Each structure stands twice: as C-alpha cells, then as structure tokens.
Amino acid sequence: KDGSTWKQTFLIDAATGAINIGLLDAEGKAPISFDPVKKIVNVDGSVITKTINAANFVMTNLTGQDNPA
Amino acid sequence: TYEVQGAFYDSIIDSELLNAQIGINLSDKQTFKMKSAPRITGARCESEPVDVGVGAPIVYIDTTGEADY
C-alpha cells in the first residue's frame, strides 16, 4: 500500500510459470523475471553461486556500452 | 619542397648588402621534401547484429596522411 494505490511486489501466473520478483520500476521493468515458455531465467543485476555448470558461456554486450569479459 | 642555404652575417654586413648576398659567403643549398598533413579518405561505421543484447557501435575511418601519430 503506497498512499491510495497498491504496487505489485511479486506475481505467479497460472497460465505460465512466470514469477516476477521485486517492486516494479517506474518503466515497469521487474528486477527478476522468469519464463518457462522460453525456458529462460532472467535476472537483472548479479548472480552469486559456489559453482556453475554449463555448456556455453556466451558473453553478451547487454547494455549499450558494456564490455563483456 | 624547399632548398635551404644560409650563413652567419657579422656586424660588417649591412641589410642592403645582406639582401644582395655579396660578401655573406652563404652555405651550399640543400633540398628537402616537406611532409603532407593528414586527411580522412572516408567515414563509416558498422556493427555486428546480435541475437541477444545490442551490437556495440564501432567507427571505421580510412585516412591518407603520413604523420607519425
């Protein structure tokens, strides 16, 4: 409850197993997003894990002026 | 290209006499080539399409100069 309105914090859709986590940005960009339809886990920010196993560490220039490395 | 010839003129040598170059006993001439300023032949910019993210802008510009740096 923010004043007279309510801001979404987290959503869990029935049709799609999408779980957005976090207060929405002014432009509507959720911090953490999910999509089983595309089989992607989308996290804006950082990820900390003891280890990671994968088959393709494909660095990307996600931002306009980023430096993948 | 220019040719260089000169020498020292003492207190005896006068401005008019120096212009006449009679008693100066100047040095033998020497010819050298004067370099050329840089110029840009063409201006362009291309970048690679990317599946995910954004292609990093790059500038390709072709010169024709001869400056050391």
Oligomer: part of a larger assembly
Largest interface: A-B, 6 and 6 residues
- What's the Cα radius of gyration of chain A? 15 Å
Q: Report strand % of chain A.
A: 15-25%
How many β-strand stretches of chain A? 4
PDB class: viral protein
Keywords: Bacteriophage, Siphophage, T5, baseplate, viral protein
Entry title: Tail tip of siphophage T5 : bent fibre after interaction with its bacterial receptor FhuA
Chains A, B: Probable central straight fiber
Task: Present the secondary structure layout.
The structure is cut from a larger assembly and holds two copies of chain A (69 residues).
Chain A: E1 10-12, E2 19-21, E3 32-35, E4 40-43
Provide a concise account of the structure shown.
This is part of a larger assembly, with two copies of chain A (69 residues). With 69 residues, the first copy, chain A, is mainly beta. The first copy, chain A, has strands at residues 10-12, 19-21, 32-35, 40-43.
What does this structure look like?
The structure is cut from a larger assembly and holds 2 copies of chain A (69 residues). The first copy, chain A, has 69 residues and is mostly beta strands. In chain A, strands 1-2 form a two-stranded antiparallel ribbon. Chain A has a two-stranded antiparallel sheet with strand order 3-4. The first copy, chain A, has no helices and 4 strands. In chain A, a hairpin with a 4-residue loop joins β3 and β4 (40-43). Chain A has strands at 10-12, 19-21, 32-35, 40-43. Helices cover 0% and strands 20% of the residues of chain A. The interface between A and B is small, with 6 and 6 residues. Chain A: It is found in: Virion. Chain A: Homotrimer. Interacts with baseplate hub protein pb3. Interacts with receptor-binding protein pb5. Chain A: This is Straight fiber protein pb4.
